[PDB]
């Protein structure tokens, strides 16, 4: 109980775990996204990484989930995308399988999130005018 050290699973080793268990250690993956001709190639790679991080952050911010790791929204879940109940999603599936399953219904969800956030912002502005 005293005098014993402890070490924990780090990088993507938690990919085989279920979605419920895999969504419990988001920070370990999140923190690793940032950190003559050969110098040009290395600088291009670094600039590409920075640009990708900025694009992801801007996409998160546009939906209203800025500065958050888990941010649940107002858009309802259409049944045409997936008809599996929560019992068979968060305890009998992994993130890779889920991504493979819903790979063809991603852009429409992003557009719906953008429109919902814009509508919420406009409604908030209207409310604050009183």
């Amino acid at each position: 109980a005293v005098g014993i050290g402890a070490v924990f699973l780090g990088f993507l080793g938690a990919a085989g775990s279920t979605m419920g268990a895999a969504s419990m250690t988001l920070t370990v993956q999140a923190r690793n996204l940032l950190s003559t001709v050969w110098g040009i190639k290395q600088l291009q790679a670094r600039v590409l990484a920075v640009e990708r991080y900025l694009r992801d952050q801007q996409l998160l911010g546009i939906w209203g989930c800025s500065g958050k790791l888990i941010c649940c929204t107002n858009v309802p879940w259409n049944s045409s995308w997936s008809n599996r109940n929560l019992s068979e999603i968060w305890d009998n599936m992994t993130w890779l399988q889920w991504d493979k399953e819903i790979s063809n219904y991603t852009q429409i969800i992003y557009g719906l999130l953008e429109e919902s956030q814009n509508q919420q912002e406009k409604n908030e502005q209207d409310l604050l005018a009183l």
Partner: antibody
Amino acid sequence: QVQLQESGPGLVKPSETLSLTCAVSGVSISGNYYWNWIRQSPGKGLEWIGNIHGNTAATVYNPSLGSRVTFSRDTSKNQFSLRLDSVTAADTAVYFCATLYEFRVYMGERISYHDYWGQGLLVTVSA
Amino acid sequence: DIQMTQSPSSLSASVGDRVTISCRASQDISSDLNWYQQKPGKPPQLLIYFASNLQSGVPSRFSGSGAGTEFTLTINSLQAEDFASYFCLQYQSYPWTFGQGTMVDLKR
């Protein structure tokens, strides 16, 4: 595999300072590990001297031996050293440097347990 | 300091015999006890951790049981390489304390 190697003088005189250094290979010493110094002598058996924390440099020592010990850690060389002051004849022993810890998942179940118990070094106190 | 007392001090057994050794504490230590083996001229080697779990790679004959202030190490089928000095180490409260040890040698 993690390996621990003890080093230091094989002989020391009474009332002098005894300095030993355990070097670690295969795992960084600055992690959340408690590096422990133990000794074994005939008649007394195994006797735990103390331990030091790699990350925070926190140290705990045996109350019986008191303030005569100081533990240090060097991250650049990946080593930890023990300095026992005012040696006597009773301090002649074989010194072991070791570490005991567990590998688990973040807020979940355990996976494995680890100890190494390096080969150790003989030290004798005499003028 | 918590005192660790082993019994018997020394015992003799033959290959395949069942060997039992008891380790007791002055005060309760929950399940924070470990059983180690030590041969002449070699460092201690872990046999049982947390008083009921077998270390990976150790033969299945070795086993540990008990709790609180009473723990037991059992070897079901002693072998030629099993003759050594066995120790119980407690790590619930500082300082760590070892038992006096129990020596098991070939019976002839």
